[PDB]
Amino acid sequence: VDVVHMDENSLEFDMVGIDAAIANAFRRILLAEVPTMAVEKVLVYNNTS
Amino acid sequence: GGLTCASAPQGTLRILEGPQQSLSGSPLQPIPASPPPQIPPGLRPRFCAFG
């Protein structure tokens, strides 16, 4: 693995010597399976906007 | 002493007022034709690959 760039909010490592199935598994995990926190419910007391 | 029919007229004149034609110049349009859409100069790529 060779990590080229690493600003904050960016990474560009290489990952030399792996198949397309494992690379695709890693890519699909980041897009759809790594957990995050986000607003689910909103209680609106007044809203004259 | 009355009015009597006189000799028949020998001719008729019909008058009308008419102006004339100018030269044919045929100036079709201020900015004429359909001017073509075209390239902005230089432009430059606005995108690069990663790595």
- DSSP annotation string for B2-36: -----PPPS-------------------SS-S-PP
From which experimental method does this structure derive? cryo-EM
Beta bridge partners of A3: A13
d(CA B35, CA B20) in angstroms, rounded, equals 36
- Chain B residue nearest residue A2, CA to CA: B51
Shortest distance, CA A5 to any CA of chain B (angstroms): 8
Distance CA B51, CA A3 (A): 10
Given in angstroms, what resolution was this structure solved at?
3.0
Q: What residues of B are in contact with residue A4 (Cβ under 8 Å)?
A: 51
Nearest to A23 by CA among A31, A11, A15: A15
Q: How far is A12 from chain B (nearest CA, A)?
A: 6
